[PDB]
Amino acid sequence: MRVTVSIIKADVGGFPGHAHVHPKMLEYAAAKLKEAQKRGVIIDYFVYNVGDDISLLMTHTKGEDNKDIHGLAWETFKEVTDQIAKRFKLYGAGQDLLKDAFSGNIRGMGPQVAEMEFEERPSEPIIAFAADKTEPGAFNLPLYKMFADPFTTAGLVIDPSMHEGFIFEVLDVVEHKVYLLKTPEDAYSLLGLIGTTGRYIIRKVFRRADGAPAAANSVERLSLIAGRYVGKDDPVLLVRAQSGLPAVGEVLEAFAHPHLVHGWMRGSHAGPLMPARFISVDPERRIAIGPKMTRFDGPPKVGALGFQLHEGYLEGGVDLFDDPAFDYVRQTAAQIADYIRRMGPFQPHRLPPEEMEYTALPKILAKVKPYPADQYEKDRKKYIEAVVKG
Amino acid sequence: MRVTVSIIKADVGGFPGHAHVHPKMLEYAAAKLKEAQKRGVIIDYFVYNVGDDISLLMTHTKGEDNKDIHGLAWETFKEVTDQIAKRFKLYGAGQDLLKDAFSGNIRGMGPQVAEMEFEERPSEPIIAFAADKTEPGAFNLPLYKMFADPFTTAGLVIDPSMHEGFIFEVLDVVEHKVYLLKTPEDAYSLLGLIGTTGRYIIRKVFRRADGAPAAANSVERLSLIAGRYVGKDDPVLLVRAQSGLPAVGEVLEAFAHPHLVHGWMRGSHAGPLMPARFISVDPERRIAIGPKMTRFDGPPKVGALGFQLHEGYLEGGVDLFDDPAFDYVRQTAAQIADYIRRMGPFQPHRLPPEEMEYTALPKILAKVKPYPADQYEKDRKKYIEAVVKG
Amino acid sequence: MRVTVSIIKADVGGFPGHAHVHPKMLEYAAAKLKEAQKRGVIIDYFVYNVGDDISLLMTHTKGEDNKDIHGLAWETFKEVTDQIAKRFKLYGAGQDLLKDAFSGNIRGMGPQVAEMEFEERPSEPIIAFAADKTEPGAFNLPLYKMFADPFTTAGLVIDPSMHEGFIFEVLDVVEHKVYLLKTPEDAYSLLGLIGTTGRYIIRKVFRRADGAPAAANSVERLSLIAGRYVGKDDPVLLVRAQSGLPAVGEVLEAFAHPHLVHGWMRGSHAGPLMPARFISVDPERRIAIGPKMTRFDGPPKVGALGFQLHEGYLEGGVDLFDDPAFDYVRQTAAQIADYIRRMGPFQPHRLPPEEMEYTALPKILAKVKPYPADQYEKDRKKYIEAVVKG
Amino acid sequence: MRVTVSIIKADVGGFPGHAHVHPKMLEYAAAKLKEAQKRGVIIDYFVYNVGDDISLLMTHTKGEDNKDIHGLAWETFKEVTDQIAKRFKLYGAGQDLLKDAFSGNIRGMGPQVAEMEFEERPSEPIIAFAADKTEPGAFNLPLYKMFADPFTTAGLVIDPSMHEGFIFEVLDVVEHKVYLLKTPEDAYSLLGLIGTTGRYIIRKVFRRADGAPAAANSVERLSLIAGRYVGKDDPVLLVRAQSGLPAVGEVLEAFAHPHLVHGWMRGSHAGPLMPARFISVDPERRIAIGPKMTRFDGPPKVGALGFQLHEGYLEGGVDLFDDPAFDYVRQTAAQIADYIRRMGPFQPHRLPPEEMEYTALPKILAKVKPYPADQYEKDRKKYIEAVVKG
Numbered sequence A, B, C, D: 001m002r003v004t005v006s007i008i009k010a011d012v013g014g015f016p017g018h019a020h021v022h023p024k025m026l027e028y029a030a031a032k033l034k035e036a037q038k039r040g041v042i043i044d045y046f047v048y049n050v051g052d053d054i055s056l057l058m059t060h061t062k063g064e065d066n067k068d069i070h071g072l073a074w075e076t077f078k079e080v081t082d083q084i085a086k087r088f089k090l091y092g093a094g095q096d097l098l099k100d101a102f103s104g105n106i107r108g109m110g111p112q113v114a115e116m117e118f119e120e121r122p123s124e125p126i127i128a129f130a131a132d133k134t135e136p137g138a139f140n141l142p143l144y145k146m147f148a149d150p151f152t153t154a155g156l157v158i159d160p161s162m163h164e165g166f167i168f169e170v171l172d173v174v175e176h177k178v179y180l181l182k183t184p185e186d187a188y189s190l191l192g193l194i195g196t197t198g199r200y201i202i203r204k205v206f207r208r209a210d211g212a213p214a215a216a217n218s219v220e221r222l223s224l225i226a227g228r229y230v231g232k233d234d235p236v237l238l239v240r241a242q243s244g245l246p247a248v249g250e251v252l253e254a255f256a257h258p259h260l261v262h263g264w265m266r267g268s269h270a271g272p273l274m275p276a277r278f279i280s281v282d283p284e285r286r287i288a289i290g291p292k293m294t295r296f297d298g299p300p301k302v303g304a305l306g307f308q309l310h311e312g313y314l315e316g317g318v319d320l321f322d323d324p325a326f327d328y329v330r331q332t333a334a335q336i337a338d339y340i341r342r343m344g345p346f347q348p349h350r351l352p353p354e355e356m357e358y359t360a361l362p363k364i365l366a367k368v369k370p371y372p373a374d375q376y377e378k379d380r381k382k383y384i385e386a387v388v389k390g
């Protein structure tokens, strides 16, 4: 049977600030999806947060880009907004749905979606990822590693079924152009694009041998609003594993170096991506509570839940960053976070100016007097005396 | 609607010594505040300890410096004293209320208060802090950082709504004088005062753009008793966050370096301020149990609980030091505590003599024979022979 | 007496690659400057390298922007080129003087200059810095710290002679505009500019009390060549110290966090700025041999030589990063270098695309087929089957 | 034969700033003492620096407090001043001799002296210490440890010849009073005094069994100048070792924890005392070049030179901090220095106000408007509106 797996994610309020979600939001969402399941809209579901982002993972047979499934998610987020977030006056209530939400970040751009449709294999292990305080390009390095780096995915070299590699669908989110690159042969060209994490983002990956969908990342084109590019952050990602696709452990190895990503405070910094445990996982209630964002509204975090599909039912989720081996990775991220923070307001800890979600540069340039450089050389002594006397 | 948020804190007994509180004290206090809520005295509340200090966080509409609210707290502490602490003969039972409590530290000086009244915003995130084994000036460094240090609060540079800075109300607790300083321009003068943490303490902070209350720290003037200055330690602090006020994560960043503070053993040492987890947080019962004070009666610790206000009701609290990123900070504090303790009785691990809560110097000077220095030079050989023969 | 201190620096060949200089280049330069000294062109000099960059430090009385002094340096570099670098076929022989040098990086842009003229004080301590494998904005963070950060320069708070702060001359190297900002009051605006290290660079600093020159950094406007901005990297910096200017140790404290800077391999990465020892310092021969660039052509390094001026004569230089306290800083930089390198070709370890000195993006875009995104959605299955069958 | 060992120390100029000395100063001093030796004024000598402080170690038979020996030192420092420091316009030329030296710290207070007279033992091992960037009380902890702490000096417990302990001569430098305390019995009283490192300083130690001089520290009473106490910093210390006095290694163990001391930048901070190697030791030329002061004008450092006396001749010196065991201690000090520096201008990293060598507090209090606290409560809203509108 063919199944679709859809993650539709949104922030509709934080608790407090942008640090976390209120547990009643998860409970409300789970109850709403249980009703949809009883009506046959969906087969199964799992509800979880990372930071202030709620992921609705849903299995169904309606295909990709389905209005009923996308509409079920939207309605669930709108009802969480109105019944829970507005009731408790949560921070940024309705953030991703309402352009006038009470927060100062990018609002009203809508949910994000990562989805795949496929014939369910004789065993169908999948991993759902969610990150907070980062951009969709945060997953470029891990996706490259797991599908194309022989230092990550041993199977590329030792599993004859993987020898032919993978096909990357890369979205230029500025010009709205798609590129298809094949590894190993196009590795250098691919990296020339996807190293620019804010512009060229891996959106989908397919197995080269047969075209099977292997991963789907939530990324959309940017919008140009009041002369700035405006994106949708805090990505979600679906990866299918095993049997010629990377092993669960090869997928997870791709997150074992907590690389610097763009986001963190005010969408305007770089910090290490910490692979984080869930606070709690309740398979029966279909809810996981993910990590909080604390120092400097982070560091950026990613959570990983594994599942096994059966006739579209989801057995799981299983927290896949829960191992002492990943404690070392978290400790590294914590130390790097402390190191980089001592840079304060300077690039490359602060992002390049065009990549900053917040800026005061127009306010600054409206007040600080410029001097054409060539004329300034003649007048410098005069201008310095004027400040001094001034 | 306008709301007042009041934290009124006291130590009325420890369990054991000065290390912690008895959980029945928290339960008694919560039950008493629930009765006040039913009668309409207060809107909502949360009860928690850090070390041996119990904070009663209360929301209400009676304004600052209200006799009913201050009296409700006093009565709650007196009843905890009589019903719980005296019953179990807790250490320092009634400490802050009774000058004759059974402990050897400063007694009977009264509760402390941190409170703010304001129009409740469309979302109203607040953080309540409590520290044990330190002075109110322990918060000088964090408050300075979060409101004035561009290496902490990115918004000062990148959020045009924050560009105008903040107004610090600084209390000289020796001469009972208030100073108002504005950052950025008065930063150096401000620091010249508040670096003297025992004398010049940040009591309130206001937003410069509109005068909005931003933070309130519990500090009062010193009392001169038997020729020593006597202060009220173990401060509490309220901070409003977001939307032109520092982000929750910028507030928390201000605690990410575990700086040395005055207090620790016997109110007479310097040690690192450890940002500590709560042992437990129960939002339904309205109680959090904070950390214990162990080695050398510390190290000094601060706890952070976040809330969202709605019509004065408190949704929370949320432990905001609960992240692996803060595990690194705690480990640093633990290592610094071990390093500094090897100094034993010497400044600057021991405090300056006028800053020590305990001293034996009068006992010492009553017994040890002085010699005027000029005459001692002539007699030194004689005096050494007299000790030797002696 | 008034004196001018000029550092004029260039790379005219490496040994091997871009890692270091040949010692005969330094010996040749020193001999040439000794001849100029005998003729009265200059008072005194010191010759040294950091990585592949040779600094000619010269004292004289000809003022800033003097053709004789600039011409003496140019001629010295041209003769080193022809007599030494071309003789031994050094790598990038004549790099900064010859557009057709044999190297693949930016060539022929000319030497850089950092110079100050002033009345020589009753004691005149100065520090000369040189960095390799980085941009002039690498010094933005240190210069800000030493002149404006009270966590670095204690004197801003505790030395009444410094209370009035400093004046920063900031160059916009894209639009060729100069801004004058005064600290403390303009700190936030200043940081809003100079955090963009590739665009807004501190060129000079002056004391606010009297206008005295305090620092001079080597930065020039960019050139727009074949549609890319082309800059002059590997900066040099002069700082005057003490007596109302930052102490030598406050200047050095500003380098005690090895912050990430732009440059390193191929002028296209970010890595930690390591404060490095000189290999050797010979005050009598007037030559210091600085550090090599090794792993990944770095990490980026800065060297610091202190001097005392007397009637323009230079007593020194003294290696000011030579202390076990700075061994810790170097070890931190070495560890951060290893961490960040595991990112490979990805931002923010790789620089933003417009900031990269090397790029293959045009070659890539000439070969990889784009698909307009809207039409790609309809054709995706077809295109994937075509790659698969292909 | 009876011998006197005298260390007379002064700063008469730095190279650069307060970081180090010029090597010609040491060479000049050694040459001058060689002439005094030829004339029979002294028996032997050794000349060395730590940071910007030059120690003249001299052996002779003229006794303590001898005008000829003190005058020889003064004259040597005055000639170094005039012939070397003023010639090269060194920083703070003549610092400790000239009230109008060109530096901003405490000037003209004179050299310091540590001296002992005794019958030369059948073997006479002695250690000379010098510290820079700290007060004489920096040696209180080490002197206490080596003579009174059984966790340091094993001989107190296991060497029957040491069982009777030691006599401490403690100087109150504020009131000019001397106390004599005997360990073990007076340990607690002693520590009650000498923990106040700025006031009660160990000046001499004697063996209790026979009164033999065991140590001499350079400390003098403070001077009250323009309402501030003014002291003489950067102490020197002589310790006799072995045979009922602490072993060389017990003396050195007392420095193996790099405890926080007062001094460092601007005489106004606390930082770890690093036991440092000499850069070079030349026994034949009678000169050792000690460490530089770098980050933040430190950290504070102590050097240790061991000697064996024979008929007053000095065989040595031997650098006693030169062992990998002390590399660990230095690394600890380097890490603690980095930790504490993140506190910036705040106590207890900044010193208590009365202990600061530099302050801007009068300048601050002359400009910042005070409000009596009781009246401020009524007017606060008005004053905040006035700043806001202002």
Ligand SMILES: O=C(COP(=O)(O)O)[C@@H](O)[C@H](O)[C@H](O)COP(=O)(O)O
Residues within 6 Å of the ligand: A241, A242, A243, A244, A245, A246, A247, A248, A249
């Ligand atoms: O060693 C492994 C499994 O052995 P096990 O069942 O524990 O004996 C795994 O590493 C697998 O080899 C890996 O996950 C690839 O599995 P397939 O995708 O080939 O099933």
Ligand SMILES: O=C(COP(=O)(O)O)[C@@H](O)[C@H](O)[C@H](O)COP(=O)(O)O
Residues within 6 Å of the ligand: A011, A017, A018, A052, A092, A095, A102, A103, A104, A105, A132, A133, A233, A234, A264, A265, A266, A267, A296, A297, B241, B242, B243, B244, B245, B246, B247, B248, B249
């Ligand atoms: O990036 C952040 C929030 O993004 P998110 O909701 O996770 O997309 C935060 O760092 C906020 O920018 C920060 O807390 C300031 O928020 P405001 O006070 O401007 O709402």
Ligand SMILES: O=C(COP(=O)(O)O)[C@@H](O)[C@H](O)[C@H](O)COP(=O)(O)O
Residues within 6 Å of the ligand: D241, D242, D243, D244, D245, D246, D247, D248, D249
């Ligand atoms: O073990 C030691 C010497 O043994 P050694 O000569 O190496 O056999 C030292 O620790 C001494 O015991 C110590 O220095 C005390 O020596 P005295 O002062 O008793 O001579």
Ligand SMILES: O=C(COP(=O)(O)O)[C@@H](O)[C@H](O)[C@H](O)COP(=O)(O)O
Residues within 6 Å of the ligand: C241, C242, C243, C244, C245, C246, C247, C248, C249, D011, D017, D018, D052, D092, D095, D102, D103, D104, D105, D132, D133, D233, D234, D264, D265, D266, D267, D296, D297
């Ligand atoms: O403590 C210091 C010097 O003391 P010293 O000569 O060793 O007694 C330095 O930190 C100076 O205070 C600092 O360099 C500032 O010096 P000035 O610029 O005021 O001379």
Ligand SMILES: [Mg+2]
Residues within 6 Å of the ligand: A011, A013, A014, A017, A018, A052, A092, A095
């Ligand atoms: Mg949010």
Ligand SMILES: [Mg+2]
Residues within 6 Å of the ligand: A011, A051, A052, A053, A132, A133, A234
């Ligand atoms: Mg989010």
Ligand SMILES: [Mg+2]
Residues within 6 Å of the ligand: A105, A133, A233, A234, A267
């Ligand atoms: Mg965001």
Ligand SMILES: [Mg+2]
Residues within 6 Å of the ligand: A011, A233, A234
């Ligand atoms: Mg988001």
Ligand SMILES: [Mg+2]
Residues within 6 Å of the ligand: B011, B013, B014, B017, B018, B052, B092, B095
């Ligand atoms: Mg108590």
Ligand SMILES: [Mg+2]
Residues within 6 Å of the ligand: B011, B051, B052, B053, B132, B133, B234
């Ligand atoms: Mg307490």
Ligand SMILES: [Mg+2]
Residues within 6 Å of the ligand: B105, B133, B233, B234, B267
């Ligand atoms: Mg107390």
Ligand SMILES: [Mg+2]
Residues within 6 Å of the ligand: B011, B233, B234
């Ligand atoms: Mg208390």
Ligand SMILES: [Mg+2]
Residues within 6 Å of the ligand: C011, C013, C014, C017, C018, C052, C092, C095
């Ligand atoms: Mg080169």
Ligand SMILES: [Mg+2]
Residues within 6 Å of the ligand: C011, C051, C052, C053, C132, C133, C234
């Ligand atoms: Mg170079």
Ligand SMILES: [Mg+2]
Residues within 6 Å of the ligand: C105, C133, C233, C234, C267
């Ligand atoms: Mg270059």
Ligand SMILES: [Mg+2]
Residues within 6 Å of the ligand: C011, C233, C234
């Ligand atoms: Mg170059």
